[PDB]
Design a protein around this ligand. Structure first.
Ligand SMILES: OC[C@H]1O[C@@H](c2nnc(-c3ccc(-c4ccccc4)cc3)[nH]2)[C@H](O)[C@@H](O)[C@@H]1O
Ligand SMILES: OC[C@H]1O[C@@H](c2nnc(-c3ccc(-c4ccccc4)cc3)[nH]2)[C@H](O)[C@@H](O)[C@@H]1O
Ligand SMILES: *Cc1c(COP(=O)(O)O)cnc(C)c1O
Ligand SMILES: *Cc1c(COP(=O)(O)O)cnc(C)c1O
Lengths: 810, 810
């Protein structure tokens, strides 16, 4: 049908049809009389998977023969989403499969909707890991993703009476055709026990054993015949575990609980023992696998020449003391040599500066669970502080600030300090964030070892986030500049030559309009909600958090409502304001924000004076599959975190690539997006980082803004008085109290500038030709935000390997 | 190679090789450089499974079109063993697969050894269910086996220091290629709650829900292209289950524990709540499935014309009140009509008279767990006792004896009484057992409803228990009388014509000798034990229980030892005495018996004066796969239960078919085996049932036997004094005390006759020609003990359906 989806040759289509019928009969054990749409989805998935296998085997054979340096990306989260369409895109099978299924009387898009998201992450950090895997395969790197196979991923969100309810995400219920269990590479992981010191070094004894069983998932590169591996570990009890009899068998669940469920926090740390077990479990199994693969090519001097370990935040930070344990206790290397190898092997990426997100584990937990690792951590600390004292003699306060061990009521280990000490490279995830790291929280470390500190601005894969989710846009671009941009996104700059082209302007606006109609129809059928598809689609989708300031958006929505009610017969640009995202189950204020958003919708959407001029919709169960639908439909992207809080953002980049304009603060990657597009082509507002600092120095007083801005005072009085909660008048008093007295994120301080900037958005939307010209300038300059660029920088500047765009044989 | 294994045609072999390589590559994702023997096993299993699929689909389609009466065999146990070889046998693929694998450089017998037993039963009852499934498919019956998919089957037995240790049987660890999950036919099962009485009848409300997810396994008939289904239910929590957040997800294990583990008792009842949940779980899911299938052809008058439900003991007895619940509470039938339908639909097989094996559930458990079922049980009881009172007016004691409700400290429901009341047929499992039921424990019921009581003597499948495990014997029989006997075992009578044939005598003895050599080599390699393969192989394999009298065998072994020590230079016929079987984990005396057997071996096997004249071997981890190896190797089958205690036995029949002679009491099916072969061709000894009764009337005094038999006194003094436990002299005092003062099974009363009868065995073994002639007379008359005969009788006399030997199209 469309060119970027590849060829539908008669021979390919015939073969796909034959294998589909083979899998329906032999694999699923159905005939066409009893088969459901789900059976048809599975038959297609097995058909497509068969095309990966030869390439997967050949890729792994190739790495064995060439023995390149191997890159191990360790993460507690991989937010993969669906795999069927992405696999077809990367193997150039999409049109052939569409034709094959059409000839069998089936609609492939309907079959795609059956697949569950692999929701093994919370949001941006887990999704970044998924984009990175895609880019590493596309760049021909010998890369392995290692994590945990959670039985239950991020919870499914239901809204009941306007409140979030959580339900278990039983994503494996129908089976996962993409994974292959490898019970033959099962490895032991140790917990508890105690340390004995013999004359032959330290020995960790009397431990409890849990088995780590790997499941492998293929990761195809873009049309290069490279298929890399994501290896996820699942916890299994040994067979003599606890071995009255019946209870001993039932108690196997205690060991197997390690891989049961993803902790559903975003930017928040809880010191729970089960989470620490998860972190060690991934690290211990992974490092044994790495070492086994290294030995099958003891001279550990070459280890950092053949192995790079990238730590995705501090979550796998125990890799540092585990690597030391193995090298010193088991391989019998002297400490100094082991440390040299460790530092050269490991690199650490930081993803947040919020103090409540930083992992600081109580010493008593580590002492009980991982007594040998605690001893190694203390020794690391003592040697590290000896270096600090030599470089800054007499600076006693610096020693306290830089210690891996934090003193207090409860002694804790600062895992970020451990990662810096034990890594040859430390990076932030956008330029402003990397600078903030060097100037504030890691300033002392930067002064000691400036060479370690780098920036690697985040990116997104253009396969999933353009070609897959927005084929209409991909096609009209390809008609002008060919297909090479899909793996070389900088080529989108060529579109600046079409900014005055009437045909291109029309085609860009036509694609957006089609995407909006499609999304409006999706809403009506799956959620019984009607929207005006001529309205401006104003979209804020991301996890619910005070720092992301969904509350600032709520204040703007109420402002627009109140202005309409004041002058009902004045023209205003119609908007559909859509907000979605999950709240962590224990985060009360985040749950209250969801309730406020739905309560505003309840009033606004049923006021006959408003008409279809303003609609407020809470998008339920925001996840990767929903992002693929709503992002192509958006006109305005809301990226409105308080300056200094969003380390990068990646949703921002997805919206830019898909033809939305951005309203945002100078935070995270927004800064770089504005720099690339030109500030004139971005809706920038609000305090910069320096302005936030100045306000903190004199003290933030929310009352001053309340006193000076009548429109703001009216909103607070409405919230307090029960205007949005007539049955429960005090329902929102905690929100009001936080905004007035305890607001860490300064919502009121950016209110005036935000509202004025929103008026400019509305003014531009009235002139569709100029709106679309600005859009073209954004899409055209989005090339920097390809994860292929990000990964090439990690490869050259951290890992010491060269990317390749060369194809392996087919 | 051998004819009974079928044809190896060039085209078939070529196709098998091609599909094996396809599964290795696409299904297992291996190449031949990295593949292990386990990978080769899986590639073969998937290759063979593909040949079942077409037949499975076509069989189920055929039943849909013809709509025959359907037979539902409900069991808490299906002891299936391995499936690969049995599937090849039933599809006539064995020689083709052997040739195909040989050409690929692989040994098929080595691949067969990799497969795990499906150990979803304890012993004879579960194995009977498996033989029955095989026979029902071979006889073309529209039959379904329904049970539970236990995650852990019967424990693996290890012997450590001569003691049984148990380890979990993690049989699903590597996957099960034979099953197909059917998550689409998942059904709800209810627990707890309470009963409300409206004007619109009773309603069971406020229940906890567990989901029952079915897994289907094919059951192929013998060369008839029929493939029936075994459907096993697995427990799953609903997704809103308990829905802080993390704990709620972890607590899903509480619901899923229902299908976690098989209770490992044989002939012993424990009133544990988890076991009651298992029993209801199977019944509730199964009955909904049955009713759904019946509606897809509400006139329940035809239900018993289209449905038969066979209850395998009382374990699924809740089917009776559940069927009543559904018909009365949900379908709104009047009680009397519902009861008529229930009784005509259900039939009950009793498998034991031991009082400690009978299920008697406390009323307080049923009241809490299944409050509506308890109400229905009381109503059944009141109506049943009203009939008893009308038939036997004034017989107040009969009313108490026959009640479903037993009075006492704790009120209980007698489940056997419930099954009799609610079934149109009640059967025992061998003639003597069926007679004992009518004369003793169910005498009152027999007097009320004599027409209900039947016998169905047990049987074994000759596919698994001759063709599969003993191909050499199958072949030499087939050379003389053709292949029809495999599905018509009565044709073995034709072998009586070859009792004087010197060639046949030689061939029978040659096959036994080959089987013995093969087993002796198996012992040496897997267990480091050396045996004399010219010795008489004296074998007792079955679960360890006081009623089975492994202790009587131990006394004979010690007697032989003591006689050798007394006259070391006298000739005695050499024996290898092999005893194996599992003890239930809580059954102390059974565990002590295992220890005694290994302790006797420790003394006997290392005494240089004994030489290779006597060896005592405990066979570890006795299970279906081990039975297939040892039974073909046996010379003497020990079937020595106290008369009146072994309801039938089925091991006895396996030994008879495979060319062992039997030493046994007149118990269970032994009676009928002796009748078929002639008493002159059996080694019968000991008390008959009537003699046991006479001894009970005057009182069993073990001291009398001790006082009168010097050889017996010597053994007891050796046990007591620490002769067999020199480091722990009192180790066996509980065994001695039980034998002398508390022996319910009268071991001493049969000692003298047993020893004398064993001397006659030895005398005959010295004359190999006459030994083999007697063997031929046993094999030749074993035809009655085919489970095909048993199933044909159930079909005609209970279920009301006609067996068919006709082939479905290929
Ligand atoms: O670089 C990718 C993205 O990482 C996000 C992040 N930064 N920290 C986390 C984070 C922290 C903790 C946990 C967590 C989860 C479970 C248990 C404990 C901690 C999850 C995510 N996520 C940042 O907020 C984004 O600005 C950034 O674009
Ligand atoms: O007909 C097939 C076989 O059934 C056996 C049996 N009779 N009862 C049981 C039995 C009873 C209870 C349980 C049980 C298991 C777990 C939990 C509770 C009870 C298991 C088996 N097994 C008899 O002992 C054999 O003589 C007979 O050949
Ligand atoms: C990209 C993405 C995120 C991250 O969005 P931000 O706006 O950068 O927080 C979160 N969740 C999902 C499902 C995503 O696809
Ligand atoms: C046949 C069989 C049994 C039953 O043997 P009995 O001697 O009748 O108790 C028990 N276990 C296994 C593994 C069997 O094959």
């Amino acid at each position: 049908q469309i060119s970027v989806r590849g060829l539908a040759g008669v021979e390919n289509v015939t073969e796909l049809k034959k294998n589909f019928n083979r899998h329906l009969h032999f694999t699923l054990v159905k005939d066409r009389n009893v088969a459901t749409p789900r059976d048809y989805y599975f038959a297609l998935a097995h058909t497509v998977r068969d095309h990966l296998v030869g390439r997967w085997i050949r890729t792994q054979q190739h790495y064995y023969e060439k023995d390149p340096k191997r890159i191990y990306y360790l993460s507690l989260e991989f937010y993969m989403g669906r795999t069927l369409q992405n696999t077809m895109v990367n193997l150039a099978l999409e049109n052939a499969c569409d034709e094959a299924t059409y000839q069998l009387g089936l609609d492939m898009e309907e079959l795609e909707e059956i697949e569950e998201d692999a929701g093994l992450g919370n949001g941006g950090l887990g999704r970044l890991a998924a984009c990175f895997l895609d880019s590493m395969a596309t760049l021909g790197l010998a890369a392995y993703g290692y994590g945990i196979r959670y039985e239950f991923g991020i919870f499914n969100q239901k809204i009941c009476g306007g409140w979030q309810m959580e339900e278990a995400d039983d994503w494996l219920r129908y089976g996962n055709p993409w994974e292959k269990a490898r019970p033959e590479f099962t490895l032991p992981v140790h917990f508890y026990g105690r340390v004995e010191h013999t004359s032959q070094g330290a020995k960790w004894v009397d431990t409890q054993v849990v088995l780590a069983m790997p499941y492998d998932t293929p990761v195809p590169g873009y049309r290069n015949n490279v298929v890399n591996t994501m290896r996820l570990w699942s916890a299994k009890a040994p067979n003599d575990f606890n071995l009255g009899y019946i209870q001993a068998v039932l108690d196997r669940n205690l060991a197997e609980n390690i891989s049961r469920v993803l902790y559903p926090n975003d930017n928040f740390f809880e010191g729970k023992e089960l989470r620490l077990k998860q972190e060690y479990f991934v690290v211990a199994a992974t490092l044994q696998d790495i070492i086994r693969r290294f030995k099958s090519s003891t001279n550990f001097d070459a280890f950092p020449d053949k192995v790079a370990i990238q730590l995705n935040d501090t979550h796998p930070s125990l890799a540092i003391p585990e690597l030391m344990r193995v090298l010193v206790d088991l391989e019998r290397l002297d400490w100094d040599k082991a440390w040299e190898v460790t530092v050269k092997t490991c690199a650490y990426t930081n993803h947040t500066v919020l103090p409540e997100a930083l992992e600081r584990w109580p010493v008593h937990l580590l002492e009980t669970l991982l007594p040998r690792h605690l001893q190694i951590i203390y020794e690391i600390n003592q040697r590290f502080l000896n270096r600090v004292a030599a470089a800054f003699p007499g600076d006693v306060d610096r020693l306290r600030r830089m210690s891996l061990v934090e003193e207090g009521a409860v002694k804790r280990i600062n895992m970020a300090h451990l990662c810096i000490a034990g890594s040859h490279a430390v990076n932030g995830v956008a330029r402003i964030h990397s600078e903030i790291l060097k100037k504030t929280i890691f300033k002392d470390f930067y002064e000691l070892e400036p060479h370690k500190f780098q920036n690697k601005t985040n990116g997104i894969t253009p396969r999933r986030w353009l070609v897959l989710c927005n084929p209409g846009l991909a096609e009209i671009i390809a008609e002008r500049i060919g297909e090479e941009y899909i793996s070389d996104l900088d080529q989108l700059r060529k579109l600046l030559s079409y900014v005055d082209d009437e045909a291109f302007i029309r085609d860009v606006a036509k694609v957006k309009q089609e995407n909006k109609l499609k999304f409006a129809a999706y809403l009506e059928r799956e959620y019984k909600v009607h929207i005006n598809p001529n309205s401006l689609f104003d979209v804020q989708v991301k996890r619910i958090h005070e720092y992301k300031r969904q509350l600032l958006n709520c204040l703007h929505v109420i402002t627009l409502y109140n202005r309409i009610k004041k002058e009902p017969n004045k023209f205003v640009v119609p908007r559909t304001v859509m907000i979605g995202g999950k709240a962590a189950p224990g985060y009360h204020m985040a749950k209250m924000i969801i309730k406020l958003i739905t309560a505003i919708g309840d009033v606004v959407n049923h006021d006959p004076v408003v008409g279809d001029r303003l609609r407020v919709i809470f998008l339920e169960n925001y996840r990767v599959s929903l992002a693929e639908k709503v992002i192509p439909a958006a006109d305005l992207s809301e990226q409105i975190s308080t300056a200094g809080t969003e380390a990068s953002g990646t949703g921002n980049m997805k919206f830019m690539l898909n033809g939305a304009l951005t309203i945002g603060t100078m935070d995270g990657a927004n800064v770089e997006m504005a720099e690339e597009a030109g500030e004139e082509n971005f809706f920038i507002f609000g305090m910069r980082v320096e302005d936030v600092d100045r306000l903190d120095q004199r003290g933030y007083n929310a009352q001053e803004y309340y006193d000076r801005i009548p429109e703001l005072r009216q909103i607070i009085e409405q919230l307090s008085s029960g205007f949005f909660s007539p049955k429960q008048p005090d329902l929102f008093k905690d929100i009001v109290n936080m905004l007035m007295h305890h607001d860490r994120f300064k919502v009121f301080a950016d209110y005036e500038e935000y509202v004025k900037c929103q008026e400019r958005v509305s003014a531009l939307y009235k002139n569709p030709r100029e709106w679309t010209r600005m859009v073209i300038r954004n899409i055209a300059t989005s090339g920097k935000f390809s994860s292929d660029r990000t990964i090439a920088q990690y490869a050259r500047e951290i890992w010491g390997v060269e990317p390749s765009r060369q194809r392996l044989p087919a």
